[PDB]
Amino acid sequence: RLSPGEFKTLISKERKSHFITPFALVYKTFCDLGYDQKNSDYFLNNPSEYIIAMRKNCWKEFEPFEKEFTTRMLSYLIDEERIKDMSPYDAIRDFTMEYPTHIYDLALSNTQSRRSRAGKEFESILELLMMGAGIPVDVQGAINQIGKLVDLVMPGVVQYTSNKRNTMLISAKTTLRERWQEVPEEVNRTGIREMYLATLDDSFSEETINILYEANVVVVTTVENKNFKYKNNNRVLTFEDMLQSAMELSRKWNNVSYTDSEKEEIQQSILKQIEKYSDFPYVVNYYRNRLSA
Amino acid sequence: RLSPGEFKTLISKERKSHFITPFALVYKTFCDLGYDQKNSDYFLNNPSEYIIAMRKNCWKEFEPFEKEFTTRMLSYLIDEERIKDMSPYDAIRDFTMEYPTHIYDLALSNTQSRRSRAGKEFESILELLMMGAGIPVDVQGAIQIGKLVDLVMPGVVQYTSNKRNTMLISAKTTLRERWQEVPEEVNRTGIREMYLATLDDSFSEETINILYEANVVVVTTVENKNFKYKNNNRVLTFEDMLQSAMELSRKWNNVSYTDSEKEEIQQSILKQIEKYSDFPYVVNYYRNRLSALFD
DNA sequence: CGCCAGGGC
DNA sequence: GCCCTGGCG
Structure with missing residues (x-):
């Protein structure tokens, strides 16, 4: 078996292991669409086109994986011993009667993921837009x-x-x-x-x-x-x-001159960001330029 | 075989037909728990208790009904001709594979209704609290x-x-x-x-x-x-x-209003009695206020 | 601690 | 046009 609480805890474990972060997905999509090869004037002049294409393709690269994920999670509910010798129709009816909460809870988790991910992906898309624009x-x-x-x-x-x-x-x-x-x-x-x-x-x-x-x-x-x-x-x-x-x-x-402290603080700001984005070459590169200037 | 858009349309049709409104549920619960007979001092003194009891009882009625609704909606996608010769295990497996957008769309519709209803019901519970308090x-x-x-x-x-x-x-x-x-x-x-x-x-x-x-x-x-x-x-x-x-x-x-303000207030109350036409307790609350303009 | 591929009321 | 029986990131 698996209680709704136990199912909820499981849902979380699998999501982590199965999905790359919103920023990672956006970055992958950025590079796949070959945006890492466009010059700054592309981003300056065509940001809407870029945003629409990013949105389109992030979704494409997410949707098939969310579909598979859901089916996997539901498989934990199927109880061979309970349903063995049921009619196939009665097996589904039983499943829709026995588990509509578990099912609801999986889908709820999915929408909540989708809402948070949509926002973080949108912000990531805009972030890479500014980075691409230089x-x-x-x-x-x-x-504050x-x-x-x-x-x-x-x-x-x-x-x-x-x-x-x-x-x-x-x-x-x-x-x-x-x-x-x-x-x-x-x-x-x-x-x-x-x-x-x-x-x-x-x-x-x-x-x-x-x-x-x-x-x-x-x-x-x-x-x-x-x-x-x-x-x-x-x-x-x-x-x-x-x-x-x-x-x-x-x-x-x-072309600005900063004080000792200001330049120090800015360096420390950029340093923090190189650290966060360590695994993403294009972004580390963006910050490095800013740091050596 | 229901398409996702068709299933959404059915879900909306069925939800409207079978669920009473958030205010109606709150009003039913208000009366079922006897709050419609309590004096103003009760509400003045016991608001937190009233709010929690209302919330619990509203949910106690709603949730079993929503569960039964979900099951009923899902049964519109069961395909007998399709599943005839599968094992029960393969039947379910197939169900979990063939209708993912459908199942998701139903649950999505459910949580969106829950969110909207939760706010409307809390608001309705507080409205009746103030009315009860007079x-x-x-x-x-x-x-x-x-x-x-x-x-x-x-x-x-x-x-x-x-x-x-x-x-x-x-x-x-x-x-x-x-x-x-x-x-x-x-x-x-x-x-x-x-x-x-x-x-x-x-x-x-x-x-x-x-x-x-x-x-x-x-x-x-x-x-x-x-x-x-x-x-x-x-x-x-x-x-x-x-x-x-x-x-x-x-x-x-005991505020004396100008005739102009008195008639605007009267209008506002009469408007609200219309909105709550179906709810005797609320109509009576408003008519006491209307009466107070002529006292 | 913010997001809302967010429909419902 | 506001709600968030709302968990994820």
């Missing part, structure tokens, strides 16, 4: 003044702490629902000047756009989605717009 | 003010005129990071203070303190306060909240 960023998940809702800080947290002038903060939510309300909260709490909110959401309202606007949160989506749903609306930006802004601001940072 | 409230789902405010004491008309001596209540069964929505709404509309009712046992001192600076006060059961937040004068119990509501409500007891 734009200096600290990844908050790789190292900055809430955890902010994923990317350009050009880094040390510089931002020094002065928020000429910096860019980016948050991401795949869909918004009412969860966009979290963002103005973080903006107001820490005195953030403005924040970019990257999304794939095709359904948010003019009311939402305006409330975010008043709060100095700028919604950024793919050019496809803007043109299809928000074409006229100058308060909705595209990734193309955001990348051009990021690039412009970044240039203000490519 | 405290005047407008229910935002029944008639500026953020859409996450559930109850407005004594009413939206009065609140709009002047928020002095009013009370606003929001509710979230669990907080996660979603508590961040509350300061956003407080700050957007200039809310003086908001009570945030929750059953969550796990929120941090940092969250408490950020909410505190935002003039949002977390309200939870006695049990949760004493187990996890015993020392902490920033975390209130439902008992504390009800005492505050009752004290503020007395300021609204």
Whole structure:
């Protein structure tokens, strides 16, 4: 047998051993699609195309594996001795009567995985976009003044702490629902000047756009989605717009002299990130460039 | 042979047909447990107990029914002609292999319903608590003010005129990071203070303190306060909240309204009686308030 | 401690 | 258009 509690604990063991991390999957997909071979202008000019292709292919490289995983987990429930000499129809009926909780719990675990993974994959996709564009960023998940809702800080947290002038903060939510309300909260709490909110959401309202606007949160989506749903609306930006802004601001940072301590802190920031991303050559390379400059 | 989209359509049709609404279930449970006969002092004094008993009993009814529903939905995909000559073991194995999107879509639909229902039911339980306590409230789902405010004491008309001596209540069964929505709404509309009712046992001192600076006060059961937040004068119990509501409500007891405000209030109440037309206890609560405008 | 490949109400 | 009987990462 296997109690629902015991099944839940098992579900977790297997998921870990069977699935590579969201960042690992994104990185694999980045390299498989040959994005590690494109120059910086590709990322600057085609971020929507890149995001859409990444999303497409990450899902392709996940979905068949989630399907197999589910079937494996359910196999632990099948009880040969209980069902032996049952009619095949009665065996399935029994299974749908005896285990609809275990079954529900497996699927619940899967959706919860999917939600967390979708967000982390989306953030990873955007992170590699900035790295491919050659734009200096600290990844908050790789190292108050900055809430955890902010994923990317350009050009880094040390510089931002020094002065928020000429910096860019980016948050991401795949869909918004009412969860966009979290963002103005973080903006107001820490005195953030403005924040970019990257999304794939095709359904948010003019009311939402305006409330975010008043709060100095700028919604950024793919050019496809803007043109299809928000074409006229100058308060909705595209990734193309955001990348051009990021690039412009970044240039203000490519010839700066730092104090002993500041340079020390920045080095320590980048060091932390080389450590986190040790196993990913393209990313370690990105940071190394920043460190020797 | 049901396609995944067809199965989704059936699941939605069947769910609508067979499950009563969150409020209807709460109202049934309220009456089944005898709360519809308790005086206001009962609710004033025993809110935490009432809330937990309501939650337990709502779930006791719902969960067996949902289990039976799930089994019934799944039986629409059993294919006799397909499975005729397989062993029972191979039959199940095949089932686990042929319908993964179907089974997942059903469970997904179930948890999404559970999430939506859990919030609506908690809100309904708190609504009936205030009604039982005899405290005047407008229910935002029944008639500026953020859409996450559930109850407005004594009413939206009065609140709009002047928020002095009013009370606003929001509710979230669990907080996660979603508590961040509350300061956003407080700050957007200039809310003086908001009570945030929750059953969550796990929120941090940092969250408490950020909410505190935002003039949002977390309200939870006695049990949760004493187990996890015993020392902490920033975390209130439902008992504390009800005492505050009752004290503020007395300021609204014999208020003389202009004819204009009186007719707007009347409109707001009459609107809510419409929403709750099917629920005698709630209609009677509102008609007492309507009657008070002519007293 | 944040995410929401998120449908339900 | 807000809910999260919500676990995963």
